[PDB]
Design a binder for this molecule. Sequence first.
Ligand code: BCL
Ligand code: BCL
Ligand code: BCL
Ligand SMILES: CC[C@H]1c2cc3[nH]c4c(c3C)C(=O)[C@H](C(=O)OC)c4c3nc(cc4[nH]c(cc(n2)[C@@H]1C)c(C(C)=O)c4C)[C@@H](C)[C@@H]3CCC(=O)OC/C=C(\C)CCC[C@H](C)CCC[C@H](C)CCCC(C)C
Ligand SMILES: CCCCCCCCCCCC[N+](C)(C)[O-]
Ligand SMILES: CCCCCCCCCCCC[N+](C)(C)[O-]
Ligand SMILES: [Cl-]
Ligand SMILES: [Fe+2]
Lengths: 299, 281, 246
Amino acid sequence: YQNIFSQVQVRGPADLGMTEDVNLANRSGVGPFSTLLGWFGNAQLGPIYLGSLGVLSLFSGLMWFFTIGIWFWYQAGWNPAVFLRDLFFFSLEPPAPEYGLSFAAPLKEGGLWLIASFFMFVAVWSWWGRTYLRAQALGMGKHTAWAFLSAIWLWMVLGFIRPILMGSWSEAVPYGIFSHLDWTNNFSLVHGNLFYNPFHGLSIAFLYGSALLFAMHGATILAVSRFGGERELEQIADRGTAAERAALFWRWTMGFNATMEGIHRWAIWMAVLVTLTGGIGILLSGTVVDNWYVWGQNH
Amino acid sequence: ALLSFERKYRVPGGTLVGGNLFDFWVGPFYVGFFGVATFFFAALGIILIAWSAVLQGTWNPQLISVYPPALEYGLGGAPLAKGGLWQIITICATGAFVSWALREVEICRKLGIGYHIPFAFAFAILAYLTLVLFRPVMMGAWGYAFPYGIWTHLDWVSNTGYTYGNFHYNPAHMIAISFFFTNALALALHGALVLSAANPEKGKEMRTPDHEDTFFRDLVGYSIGTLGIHRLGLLLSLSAVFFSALCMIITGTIWFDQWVDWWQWWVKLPWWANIPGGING
Amino acid sequence: DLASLAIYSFWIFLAGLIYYLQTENMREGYPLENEDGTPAANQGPFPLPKPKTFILPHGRGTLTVPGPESEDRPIALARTAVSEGFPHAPTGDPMKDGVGPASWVARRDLPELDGHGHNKIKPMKAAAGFHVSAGKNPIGLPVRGCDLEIAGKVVDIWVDIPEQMARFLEVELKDGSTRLLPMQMVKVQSNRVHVNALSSDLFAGIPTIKSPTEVTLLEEDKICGYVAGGLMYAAPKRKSVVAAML
Ligand code: BCL
Ligand code: BCL
Ligand code: BCL
Ligand SMILES: CC[C@H]1c2cc3[nH]c4c(c3C)C(=O)[C@H](C(=O)OC)c4c3nc(cc4[nH]c(cc(n2)[C@@H]1C)c(C(C)=O)c4C)[C@@H](C)[C@@H]3CCC(=O)OC/C=C(\C)CCC[C@H](C)CCC[C@H](C)CCCC(C)C
Ligand SMILES: CCCCCCCCCCCC[N+](C)(C)[O-]
Ligand SMILES: CCCCCCCCCCCC[N+](C)(C)[O-]
Ligand SMILES: [Cl-]
Ligand SMILES: [Fe+2]
């Protein structure tokens, strides 16, 4: 038995969750129970907290998706068959260079893109506020909100900060499945190969490293789950043989190890540094460094 | 030196080979038969690389590079200076990686824990082997493998990719990337949640797992659970590597042209292939 | 050059972070000791971090780390060589003494509490509303050990109430008493529950719990360590795969 999938599922009264300082009035009712999910993790869905910040976020979120969707349907001649076969090829492009950073572009030539970006901007930041508040209501630390900022950073640099510093919305990313891939490839071409951007290489080390570390941590916990290993919070407060065997596996393997609490500090930074270094690398491209190959020759 | 709770665990037994011959430690490192095997392989490999550096004429870490046999050599052997050295070093690397895994297994047995870790690591090894062994062989030549050099291997990645246009269009590659991104997302989430619960607002008591399920339930309407999150992290990581190996194994063996063209099968579907309008109409 | 100044500053930062992370992961297990229990000469290049204090809910006090080692019980192991780095063999029965892969830690002899202060784990028969929702129900099945003999029968499932999951199977032995078996160490089949880590004659030896309605962290550790220890120490009584294939 490897404990990858549960052998027997057990169920009881729906769990409504801790109260603490949260406004119980904004909490929805319990959702259905999924036996399918129950084989892998919890079977219970909901309840969810739906305050004003969340409603606003969901609203802009939908408007963003709607704005893109209406442009795609327009590109499809309002033909369902065409909409589906060309779905990955449609693209909502930003204003042309001639428009700079103005909001003058006509709807079909950058205006819809600007609207789409406004809705996305509001959706993401309102959601970020939500991650902070939900932690505050339960008296928890703000580690989730902080980590989320790192991801927000790359996004901000790509569609707002860099375009603004470059002087035009045309520098931003289009909304499209294949189009945004073309944009990514072109971005490297235009800046003399990103493999030469030092921050791009670091970002890769952390992306690889996150898969490396989570495979390591996930496998470790499962390996000591026979000693209640996943109850990490209590293992932190009162170390057990699960924590000891886990630490010793690694100390005997690579000469050093972590603690039940400390491993989660290694984890959060490993992931967070992915977009932190990534954002810096992109922000420097085109504003300070035009060609990384050339740059590399002088450093 | 030992950790203050270590003694009771440094017990005999667990080895897969050599009985108690290599059953001992050196500082914090456990040895075992596979401990010495790893050392052997790693040393020989590093030595052969240093020799290849000499034949190349440099000691610069940024310049040293060992290339495999040129396409002319097919799947046969080659002169130590023209692909042969890479070939031996590849054997040593494989021997060292596998030995490292098997050493991890002995350590698992001695501690009475599961074998998940070495199992996970095997996925990494299998990814390496795909680029350096399985794909080259299926393609018919060792030349298709990548060179061992800090920057030279990046050139190989670039040239290999552009041989098929923009590699982004490789469907298996897309799935692999999704797994890498989602994994990093999950890793950040797990780290932050545990820490946010163990380190609540200054002056408050340690939160419980209940607070963790509640936080995410409040946030997205679903909580995977303390056991599931670890199960997920392992799955995403391995799936990312699994699909990496798959996206490459098929390139140059069953797919030869520009990856972007592969998507025509979807656009050319009978019921909408010829309908005018749209991007492809 | 801005790019150059940036990459230069990053490495300074990274080294500082690694330094921070490493010392932070030294809240437990340090200072390092010699194989005889005395402080080791080389404590490494990383100093101990300043103490932090965890405030534990429901009158469980506090926890301050780094702090003096908690472990102090007898370890039934004897040195095997004059030189450091070698195994320490069991002076008696490792399974009963709790050493090697059968080790257990002196965790608080109280049950783990949920967010309300209620016991986290409880036998299902007493867990209002809980039931097997999917998969083969283990209750009522005979339990087989690696020697391929029946060691008892399953009489209940101990569930984690807050996380709604099965944690232990309660097995009734021949003498009428019962023991708890960790879920991740059993294999529920269609006509039985197989336990590879233990031979039938070792079940009686599984550590017991004071109360029949709750289990403490101390007891869980003794139970889990003992069962795992069987993979190594019960190897002689574990019948081959082809033998079990009948
Ligand atoms: C030909 C193409 C170029 C190239 C061009 C680029 C470009 C361009 C960029 C990268 C970037 C990256 N590249 Mg590169 N790259 C190349 C080759 C490689 C190779 C390789 C060959 O093996 C690898 C492994 C990588 C790897 C990487 C990653 C390390 C990095 C992306 C990090 C990330 O997590 O972003 C994913 C994370 C995000 C985008 C953050 C998202 C956060 C927001 C808030 C999400 C909100 C979503 C929400 C509103 C909508 C959906 C909601 C639903 C509920 C789901 N590149 C080649 C040379 N690469 C990025 C970087 O940082 O570069 C330094 C970047 O911009
Ligand atoms: C996976 C797809 C490609 C590939 C694509 C890329 C791309 C694209 C990039 C890298 C980058 C790196 N690659 Mg690579 N790389 C490949 C296969 C390998 C193999 C291998 C044995 O299979 C190795 C050891 C490396 C090693 C390296 C590192 C030098 C560097 C950062 C990786 C990292 O932090 O990972 C996460 C792992 C950790 C955080 C653990 C620590 C690992 C340490 C740092 C590895 C040191 C390697 C050492 C110098 C190699 C020789 C060791 C002995 C002398 C033999 N690559 C395959 C062929 N690699 C990045 C770079 O900066 O390149 C210069 C980068 O941009
Ligand atoms: C211009 C180039 C093309 C392109 C061409 C390629 C090519 C070509 C390849 C990839 C591959 C990959 N690409 Mg791509 N790719 C592009 C753009 C991207 C972008 C992006 C944001 O645009 C992303 C995110 C990616 C992402 C990915 C990954 C899914 C995958 C590499 C990881 C891997 O396989 O790990 C697997 C992990 C390993 C191989 C590591 C094994 C390590 C071993 C086991 C141990 C080593 C130990 C070490 C020696 C120890 C030293 C001692 C020290 C003490 C540590 N690509 C562009 C369009 N991509 C690669 C792939 O899929 O590989 C199968 C690949 O070959
Ligand atoms: C499969 C999922 C992910 C994963 C998992 C993973 N890796 C693992 C484990 C796991 C679970 C371990 O248990 C093991 C470990 O101990 O980690 C601390 C390991 C490990 N992953 C490592 C690296 C690594 N993992 C990577 C990736 C991945 N690992 C995936 C993303 C990568 C990359 C590039 O993404 C790297 C670089 C090692 C740190 C460690 C294994 C240590 C080891 O094998 O040691 C024995 C060998 C030596 C000490 C040296 C041998 C050198 C050779 C003789 C020469 C080889 C030359 C080489 C082929 C070229 C190098 C030049 C490059 C510039 C190309
Ligand atoms: C069916 C609609 C699917 C369209 C969603 C497109 C997601 C790709 C987003 C890339 C945009 C990058 N960005 C935000 C920085 O501009
Ligand atoms: C923060 C992630 C950075 C990834 C590089 C990981 C380096 C591991 C260094 C180990 C240093 C600690 N030490 C000396 C005690 O072994
Ligand atoms: Cl903190
Ligand atoms: Fe964890």
